[PDB]
Amino acid sequence: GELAQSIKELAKSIKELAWSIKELAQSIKG
Amino acid sequence: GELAQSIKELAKSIKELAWSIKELAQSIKG
Amino acid sequence: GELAQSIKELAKSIKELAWSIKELAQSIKG
Amino acid sequence: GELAQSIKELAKSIKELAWSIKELAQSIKG
Amino acid sequence: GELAQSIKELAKSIKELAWSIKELAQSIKG
Amino acid sequence: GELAQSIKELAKSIKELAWSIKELAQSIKG
């Protein structure tokens, strides 16, 4: 149901956060 | 129920954080 | 119940910290 | 149950991450 | 079922976020 | 069975997340 649906949305948001953190790590090196 | 609603709010707030981290990275780069 | 209320409060804090990070990124740019 | 308690623990860690990113941005702004 | 499947993807996304944060920490320390 | 193993993988990923955020704080402060 909607519990599982909401957890899939949360997982997708966490993947987007992990990508932004990789971008920040690269920008710190220049 | 309200648990599923709170998880969806958390997912939207994490997406907001990911976008702000992407902007921070570009500012350090430029 | 209690756990869903807590998750919603934490989501709001994360959202507000995201807004603050974006403001800092904006002034690092100039 | 345990599922909601784990989501709450995750949200606490994400909030702590956002505070660390803010302090990183502040140190770079100087 | 769907609930187990959604929690799998959630756990794997959190593992990827943890790895990205370690990469950030190492970039910051230099 | 499969849901039970979901939960346990989620719990381990959240401990790894917590450890990585401690590393991030130490690198910022150093």
Residue numbers in the entry:
A (entry chain D), B (entry chain E), C (entry chain F), D (entry chain A), E (entry chain C), F (entry chain B): 1 to 30
Article excerpt on this structure:
Not all of the peptides with e = g = Ala were soluble, therefore, some were made with g = Ser or Glu, and suffixes “-Sg” or “-Eg” are added to the systematic names. By contrast, those of the βL class and peptide CC-Type2-LL showed weak or non-specific binding of DPH. In addition, we found hitherto unreported plasticity in the βL class of structures: compared with CC-Type2-IL-Eg, CC-Type2-IL-Sg—which differ at peripheral g and c sites—is a fully collapsed CC structure above tetramer. The latter makes an incomplete slipped barrel of five helices with a sixth helix packed against these to fill the void completely and consolidate a hydrophobic core; i.e., screw symmetry is broken in this structure. The two collapsed structures were more complicated. Nonetheless, both had extensive KIH interfaces linking all helices and, as such, are CC-based structures. CC-Type2-IL-Sg only had identity symmetry element (E) due to a Type-3 interfaced helix docking into a slipped barrel architecture, Fig. 4a. Sequences with β-branched (Ile or Val) residues at both a and d or with Leu at a plus Ile at d (ββ and LI classes, respectively) form cyclically symmetric, blunt-ended structures with central channels, i.e., they are α-helical barrels. βL class peptides adopt slipped barrel-like or collapsed structures depending on the amino acid at g.
